[PDB]
């Protein structure tokens, strides 16, 4: 008997840890090389000093985990190494229950390869994997602490829930019906955190000096100071100066990573050798591409339109309940005022009879997926749904991905 | 007087905002009755007053209300909680 091991195989960072553990660890799954050729692996990227022109290589080419070599390398680093990760040690893998996650739309052959490697190269006793939205309904089984906001004012799983998974690759609209997502209503919004970073790259390269090669610098800039307009784009542009912030450029002799200052608040003087970049319009005009892709000259439709289409493709009787039970998760949702704007803009388009309740977890929203996944792993539903090693051996490789995990069963 | 048109527009715009909000339509409440002599007849007006349909409205309201009472008896403890059942949500929508 052993508690299951839960891993969130994200394309940007990997959340993992024993089910008994309270909060998971982090693993930035990317093999990076510097200008001079020295290579860095996973969390060691945080130890780079010449942040200028480091190149990131990832196994998820476009949300699909293609290159398996480095994926296995980062899995080995994250699981086997006990020194860095607080003494946790996956000794042999055999006789260990593993619950994983994957992109909701993975090619059948790619999923076949994934199941094959995870079953036979590592020899886990049992496995269950699915997109994070599949684990979302199991928030009923535990006493979660997630703040909720309604858009109309200023048996261990919920049957009806709608999940907006805005992560690194794409923003997903996954409506789940009693556990199985209605895969016909699954809609992909191509806008995501990676595109957001690229847009910040272009805007900062034009407005200020060329930052077209400072990928980690702009990533930290997006991390620290960004927001969706609390009311509307026009309102934020009217008060652009009042909410302006300035970002301190990196100083290699003192701080490898930069930091942001609030000019209005009283704070320490900067040394005269420090270069400063002011942000007055890129703070809010970049996140607005979720609602108005036309601002950044993108022909793709916005998030509200994707949600509307996903609701339209749903059965008529259930769509109002789906509207009422929309829950947000993913890395992008932690930026301020995104949930409120989503709720208000969605309510403005729905019939007055319906009311939309938007619930977003507090704290870092990236860790919510792992939390709900782990809390599901410790329930009888996980015990029933899991597939055993000998059962996998009994069937052909395609059987698992075509029947028990992949979309091919529910399509 | 052509040069004074802008002033007139500004003043009228200033006054309309306060004028429109807190006024009672005296025409709607039959407080104004000097135009009625032009297009209305005495016996026609008294016949329309006698032929009012208040009873039909009251009886239909009572019929709908007793149907709602029966529906509430069937449903039981009504609540506005977040909906997790098609039956419960549909019945609440019917009630509203």
């Amino acid at each position: 008997e052993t508690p299951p091991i839960v891993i969130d195989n994200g394309s940007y960072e990997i959340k993992f840890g024993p089910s008994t553990n309270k909060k998971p660890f982090r693993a930035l799954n990317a093999l990076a090389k510097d200008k001079f050729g020295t290579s860095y692996l996973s969390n060691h990227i945080k130890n780079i000093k010449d942040i200028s022109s480091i190149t990131f290589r990832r196994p998820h080419e476009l949300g699909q985990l293609t290159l398996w070599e480095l994926e296995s390398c980062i899995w080995d680093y994250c699981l086997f190494n006990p020194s860095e990760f607080d003494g946790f040690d996956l000794k042999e893998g055999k006789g260990h229950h593993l619950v994983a996650s994957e992109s909701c739309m993975t090619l059948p052959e790619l999923s076949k390869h994934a199941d094959q490697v995870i079953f036979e190269e590592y020899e886990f006793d049992s496995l269950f994997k699915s997109p994070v939205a599949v684990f979302v309904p199991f928030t009923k089984s535990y006493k979660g602490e997630m703040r909720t906001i309604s858009g109309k004012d200023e048996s261990d799983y919920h049957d009806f829930q709608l999940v907006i998974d805005s992560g690194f690759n794409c923003t997903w609209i996954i409506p789940v019906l009693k556990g199985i997502p209605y895969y016909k209503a699954v809609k992909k919004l191509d806008i995501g955190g990676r595109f957001l970073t690229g847009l910040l790259k272009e805007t900062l390269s034009f407005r200020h000096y060329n930052m077209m090669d400072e990928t980690i610098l702009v990533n930290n800039i997006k991390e620290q100071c960004l927001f969706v307009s609390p009311v509307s784009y026009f309102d934020s542009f009217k008060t652009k100066d009042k909410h302006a912030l300035e970002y301190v450029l990196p100083d290699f002799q003192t701080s490898f990573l930069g930091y942001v200052r609030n000019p209005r608040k009283e704070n320490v003087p900067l040394p005269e050798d420090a270069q400063i970049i002011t942000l007055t319009d890129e703070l809010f005009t970049i996140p607005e591409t979720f609602f108005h892709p036309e601002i950044s000259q993108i022909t793709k439709p916005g998030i509200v339109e994707a949600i509307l289409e996903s609701l339209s493709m749903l059965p008529e009787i259930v769509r109002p309940l789906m509207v009422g039970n929309i829950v947000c998760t993913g890395g992008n949702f932690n930026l301020p005022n995104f949930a409120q704007r989503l709720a208000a803009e969605l309510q403005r388009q729905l019939p007055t009879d319906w009311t939309c309740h938007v619930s977003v977890p507090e704290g870092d929203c990236a860790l919510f997926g792992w939390e709900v996944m782990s809390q599901f792993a410790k329930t009888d539903s996980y015990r029933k749904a899991r597939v055993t090693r000998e059962e996998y051996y009994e069937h052909g490789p395609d059987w698992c991905t075509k029947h028990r995990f992949g979309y091919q069963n529910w399509i | 007087a052509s040069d004074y048109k802008d002033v007139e527009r500004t003043l009228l715009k200033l006054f309309k905002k306060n004028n429109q909000v807190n006024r009672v339509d005296l025409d709607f409440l039959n407080l104004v009755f000097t135009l009625n002599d032009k297009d209305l007849t005495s016996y026609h007006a008294e016949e329309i007053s006698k032929l009012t349909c208040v009873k039909n409205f009251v009886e239909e309201v009572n019929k709908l209300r007793e149907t709602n009472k029966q529906l509430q008896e069937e449903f039981g403890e009504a609540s506005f909680l977040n909906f997790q059942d098609a039956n419960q949500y549909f019945k609440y929508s019917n009630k509203q």
Binding site: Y157, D159, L177, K178, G179, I180, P315, E316, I317, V318, S381, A385, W410 | A86, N87, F90
Partner: peptide, 15 residues
């Protein structure tokens, strides 16, 4: 009402 009958037949995390 018949849509509810159709909805109840949907899979419920089984097969």
């Amino acid at each position: 009402s018949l849509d509810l009958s159709a909805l109840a037949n949907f899979p419920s995390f089984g097969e």
